[PDB]
Amino acid sequence: SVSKANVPKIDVSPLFGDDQAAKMRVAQQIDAASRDTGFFYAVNHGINVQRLSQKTKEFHMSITPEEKWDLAIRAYNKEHQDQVRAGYYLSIPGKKAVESFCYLNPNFTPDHPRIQAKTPTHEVNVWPDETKHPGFQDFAEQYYWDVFGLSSALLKGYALALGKEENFFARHFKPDDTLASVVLIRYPYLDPYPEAAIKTAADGTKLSFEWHEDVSLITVLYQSNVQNLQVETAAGYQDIEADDTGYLINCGSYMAHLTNNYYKAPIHRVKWVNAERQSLPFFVNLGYDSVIDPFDPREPNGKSDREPLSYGDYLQNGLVS
Ligand SMILES: N[C@@H](CCCC(=O)N[C@@H]1C(=O)N2[C@@H]1S[C@H](CO)[C@@H]2C(=O)O)C(=O)O
Ligand SMILES: [Fe+2]
């Protein structure tokens, strides 16, 4: 069988406070995890994840085919040419099992300057009818800000881990312009399960999704308590244990770029499991114009031979790829 990946549980609660040495001890743990498998569980994070799971389940289980077309991104509904990112991503019964709903910064309203300019990667969220889904929009928007807050705290820990001041990343992660997204992914139980929705890896493993690096600075993920994720290490792919009380954290490829691969974006994949479950990532993205100068923490002078890349260029390029 597959070895279990080392995915430590880190109490991140000091990152919300003013005990600087305690924050450094958290930063060390983040450093160690980042340099090992690239994953850790954030615990004592303050978010009500059971309620998140319950509200998300109520939504997934009550939304109708009519509503899904009405909310569909343009890959599924040609009428919705402005919806590249935000909206409903339909299942295809007999073929594609997964379905999801993505939303972006609630501050991307029609009057937002980037929406007015039609800047790539910015969209105004779409929502189901309030009467059919009472409280869902308000809950989902509040969740965005709850997970934004956790993510800001985690970015302080990453900054300290890399030898920087604690606002090194967080100063570019702002409510008025963050390109961060929430995705509410449903993985269904199906009997029989469509073979066309099952991929097989080179090593024989049945997959729902093949290997990838995340398009993000960091990813902040809640999942149901059903083991499914694997990470590629030198020892081969290893199983990441489930923990539905914590947030699974890893770096995306923007972090790898900025740190000259000192904090790699780990390659990971999703095993096929025939189980009704949830995968609720928050992709921590900066602003469209955010640029952090690449560096290299392994080098005495900290200098890197990588070219600066704006977050908006990174994201546009990554989402297409
Ligand atoms: N629409 C988003 C970007 C979504 C990126 C994405 O689709 N991620 C993969 C996916 O689906 N999975 C990975 S992350 C996560 C596991 O690696 C999830 C899963 O399948 O569980 C946006 O515009 O910002
Ligand atoms: Fe991923």
CA quadruple 300, 305, 307, 310: dihedral, nearest 10: -30
**Which position among 268, 282, 283, 295 bears the catalytic label?**
268
Gap between the Cα atoms of 98 and 45, Å rounded: 28
State in Å: Cα 217 to ligand 1 middle: 14
- Full 3-state SS string of the chain: CCCECCCCEEECHHHHCCCHHHHHHHHHHHHHHHHCCCEEEEECCCCCHHHHHHHHHHHHHHCCHHHHHHHECCCCCCCCCCCCCCEEECCECCCECCEEEEECCCCCCCCCHHHHCCCCCCCCCCCCCCCCCCCHHHHHHHHHHHHHHHHHHHHHHHHHHCCCCCCCCHHHCCCCCCCCEEEEEEECCCCCCCHHHCEECCCCCEEEEEEECCCCCEEEEEECCCCCEEEEECCEEEECCCCCCCEEEEECHHHHHHCCCCCCCCCEEEECCCCCEEEEEEEECCCCCCCCCCCCCCCCCCCCCCCCCCHHHHHHHHHHC
Gap between the Cα atoms of 100 and 91, Å rounded: 8
> Is 122 assigned a catalytic role?
no
Burial class (CB in 10 A: 0-12, 13-18, 19+), 159: buried
Q: Across-strand partners of 92? A: 96
Experimental technique for the deposited model = X-ray
> Is 209 assigned a catalytic role?
yes
> Is 133 assigned a catalytic role?
no
Gap between the Cα atoms of 227 and 49, Å rounded: 17
Ligand 1 atom 1, closest CA: 85
What number does the ligand 1 atom closest to the CA of 221 have?
A: 15
Query: Domains in the chain, start-ordered, CATH in brackets?
Result: 1-321 (2.60.120.330)
First to last CA, the chain: 32
State in Å: Cα 139 to ligand 2 middle: 24
**Which position among 214, 282, 283, 295 bears the catalytic label?**
214
Ligand 1 proximal residues by C-beta, below 6 Å:
85, 102, 181, 183, 185, 209, 268, 270, 279, 281, 283, 319
> Is 214 assigned a catalytic role?
yes
What number does the ligand 1 atom closest to the CA of 283 have?
A: 24
Peptide bond into 192 cis (omega under 30): yes
Enter the resolution in angstroms: 1.6
State in Å: Cα 69 to ligand 2 middle: 26
